[PDB]
Amino acid sequence: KESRAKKFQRQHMDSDSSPSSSSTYCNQMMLLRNMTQGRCKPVNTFVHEPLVDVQNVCFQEKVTCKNGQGNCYKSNSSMHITDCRLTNGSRYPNCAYRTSPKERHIIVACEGSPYVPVHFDASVEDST
Structure with a gap:
């Protein structure tokens, strides 16, 4: 039975492939990672960083989850x-x-x- 931690890796992590996502990356990944079962998930985010860097977010900046009633963590760095x-x-x-x-x-x-x-939970686009 899939743990929540492993489900997060399946749905949101891509530490192992090359850094550069080609035009058909999402077509393949959304099927591979089981996000098109009975429906096409409208929007999904994969993170191209080392797992430890993403795990470390869990002791970085404390922010309110979008549901308004939970502790979430924002990455110090743009990823x-x-x-x-x-x-x-x-x-x-x-x-x-x-x-x-x-x-x-x-x-x-x-x-x-x-x-x-x-x-x-969400992603943040810093203004430039």
């Missing part, structure tokens, strides 16, 4: 992420995605011992 966004014409099982690499802070909810991310 390499890829947003997968469902194309307007897509209908299950033909779930096609736009692949959008970007640099954003991540906000996660953490749990367990060791205390590690179990929920991807």
Whole structure:
């Protein structure tokens, strides 16, 4: 039975592939990671960083979760992420995605011992 910690890695981590997401990365990943079962998940974020760096977020900046009633953590650093966004014409099982690499802070909810991310809460785009 899949732990919440492992589910977070499945749904939101990509530490092992090359840093550069190609145009068909999301098409493949959203199927591979089981996010197109019975539905095309509209938007999903994968984090292209080492696992330890993402785990360490759990003792970084304390912020309120978007639900307004929980402790979440914001990464001190902007991280390499890829947003997968469902194309307007897509209908299950033909779930096609736009692949959008970007640099954003991540906000996660953490749990367990060791205390590690179990929920991807939001991302933050710093103004330039």
